[PDB]
Amino acid sequence: MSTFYQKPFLKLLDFTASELTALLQLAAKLKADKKNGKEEQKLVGKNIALIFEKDSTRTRCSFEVAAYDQGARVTYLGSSGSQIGHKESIKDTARVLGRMFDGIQYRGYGQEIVETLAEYSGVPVWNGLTDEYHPTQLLADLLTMQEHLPGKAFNEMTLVYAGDARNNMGNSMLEAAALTGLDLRLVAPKACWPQAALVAECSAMAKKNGGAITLTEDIASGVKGADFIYTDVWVSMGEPKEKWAERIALLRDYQVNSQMMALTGNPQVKFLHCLPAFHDDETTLGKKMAEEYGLHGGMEVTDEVFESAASIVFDEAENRMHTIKAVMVATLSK
Amino acid sequence: MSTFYQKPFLKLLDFTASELTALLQLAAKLKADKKNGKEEQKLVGKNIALIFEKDSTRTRCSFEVAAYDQGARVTYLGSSGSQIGHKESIKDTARVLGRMFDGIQYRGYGQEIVETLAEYSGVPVWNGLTDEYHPTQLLADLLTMQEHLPGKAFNEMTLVYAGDARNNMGNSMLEAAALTGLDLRLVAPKACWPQAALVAECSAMAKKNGGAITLTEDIASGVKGADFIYTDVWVSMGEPKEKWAERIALLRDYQVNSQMMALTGNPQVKFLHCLPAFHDDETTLGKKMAEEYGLHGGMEVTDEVFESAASIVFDEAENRMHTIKAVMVATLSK
Amino acid sequence: MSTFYQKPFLKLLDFTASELTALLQLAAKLKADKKNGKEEQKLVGKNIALIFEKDSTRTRCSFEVAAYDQGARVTYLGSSGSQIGHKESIKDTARVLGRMFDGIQYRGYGQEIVETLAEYSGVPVWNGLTDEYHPTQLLADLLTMQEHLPGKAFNEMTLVYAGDARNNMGNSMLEAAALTGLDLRLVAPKACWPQAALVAECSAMAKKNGGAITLTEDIASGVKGADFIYTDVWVSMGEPKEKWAERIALLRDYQVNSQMMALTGNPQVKFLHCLPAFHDDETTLGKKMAEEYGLHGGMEVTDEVFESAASIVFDEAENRMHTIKAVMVATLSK
Fold first, then answer.
1. CB–CB of C275 and A92 under 8 A?
2. Domain span at A29
3. Is A282 within 8 Å of B73 when comparing Cβ atoms?
């Protein structure tokens, strides 16, 4: 645990399995302490900056609550202005921020941006999200998996990412398998697989640690034995709207529905999903896409799965805050 | 007072007259305590979310100061992003926020949004403003009226809303008359009256409580005997600009000016107005509208009334903060 | 020091040389105390408003950290909404804010706006930046100059502003020379000189205080003997892009480079610059301007000077926070 003090948190592969175990134990302690009304503040007098170049309105909440609970003050710097590196270089920005703040949370674009912030600020920099990795969500998922399979090592678990696994969360799961020996199934069309070189590197590491990484288009063999099925949205705003039709055509067979859950053969399989999810007609955008592409009842997951007892998405969402807090406490307090 | 603990505050009609009296007494105590330098913080360790879908830059101030004074921390989520229910359903948003925050203040659109937040968050949700009601402003006005008519019950007071009463504040005043027995005069062109069914319902209730609700186009009989004349702006950005000419033509006879104040026959009549007000040429928009529609000297209220000794608009504005604070304290602290 | 209590800070000329000396001593004490882990909070329970009509995303950081360190709470009101005086008059806004907040920091447009805020709010108002002055940056520069020339009075120092001195910082330096007896050199094309009347007024004052103000196009005589060379960007977004070519043509001879530094004849000359600076190709805008106008290697300052041992820009940037804090402490705490 002492190995975290004054260090950044830029991706999971910068840490050992034992360090990850200690971090998740801290998150679980902080969660229990707050639930029981006995949280001990370790960050009184610390000032934290949130550099959120990529942002939704709600994104800041888990980070602010984590800091506030621990006694720190927060300065939120959102995506309304220009990007970092537009008017001022990343190195210059890092040097200025590092004299003002005790810690910096980053959410944005290329991994090199957060590496430069970490190198030149002189204070812990925590990667919430980059193009390459989604460490904040990964930690939240890992804690949630432990809570719902108590007393199991990660190398005893099987996790499925269904749908479009070619993104920063797919990469973070590859890292998790590499480090912890997780049995990881990326169940996806071949065009939606993470890059082969990173897959090959993490697969060699995972093997050494008692795990395995499988990429397959076949849903029945892919999800068999799963303890958890994770998915996320199939289309994003920014990727051109005229590509949505072919992407949806490719991905709609990979919808997490009651059939896919039953194909695991595991009555205790649980469902995960980085929020927001398009699972019904109760959003303007979800209702439009359901009508335009024929997806009433839910897109990447059905309303039935999303609201089922197997769905643990709101525990997962809450656990973002507890694991963010563990990172801040472990790196800022001795 | 104990009846408020862990409850939402969604509209005045959810409360009894006695509960309202106790709430306003708490606001007056908190105001006195702060003025005398002896405020006791009841909200240390509480995290409050401000979900302000409809916002002006200044709107957050009264809510943040109220929370800060009481020791709470605040996360402001403004109207720059997408609306709630665009990308994530209201129910999903409520469930996530309710695990993070101890209380949620909402300012936005339909009343059903704030009802859903209240139902699914599991924490107190306070309605600052919806399409239907303006509870935060109503409480501020009621406290201000008590302060300027000490020792009078609301059923001993006469309040006039002059101008366009067809809006959320008109509805909140109908509720206030229904509940407290206020003598309420909506002095307005018939096209600018609140909906007849809500008027009829509140009129039956008001009668039972010793009050009365009058809707009239006649200014002389409408304002006679008034203790307070309230008004607000006649045109809003969003309503189409080409409708302004007919609206102003309809409403300009209802300007609160020295003549209307004298027609009350009450030398102690006071003037109220939810800020901002267009009362002179010292705003870019007010100066343009004054020139375009012939309203130099003030629109819905003249500069003379606005700056007169009868004007209590800045006491009213300050009392937003004290009454907001009373709602937060009454619902979050036992 | 007692003369600051409950006063605004609108421009340097509102203060005496002795008051400025005491303010900078307070800033140096607060800086030392924080570095040594023994800061004593003087602003617990104070609520401060940041009215930043002109804003970059990073601008709020120094003000928030200063307030947070001292125990105050902050409400940031940014430039995303409409300007003050668009929908509500400055006087009305000042009266409302002054009942809510203990102090108000302003960054924006005309000096009359901040004067009106100060006059009608009833609480200390601090001018961070207006069209006419840049007091926050001036105080940071003065502290930085003292730190790098310990035991020297300002009337023993020579400061150069190279480049376009016709702006709010040039005006603030004229005031500093007027008040402290600084030897101030504005080394600039004649079209980029501050207004003659303000120059003549401050020159009369500076003479009385043992200083001098020189405006010259001649770089060799202008910078000779300098203790410090300050500069800032040559072109701003808002000024029309088609004027950039002639402005750059006029200003590029005034680039702070190794040659200009050597022309001082002073091996210990230091370099200052209100950040951000365009000193290399590591910003999108800087790289485009370097390519379009032939300025690879740096615009108003070369990368070599900017990264040299003589460059003290990051000490200067940090000292914004310590001097802001001194203003808040001196005016809010007895």
1. yes
2. 1-136+320-333
3. no
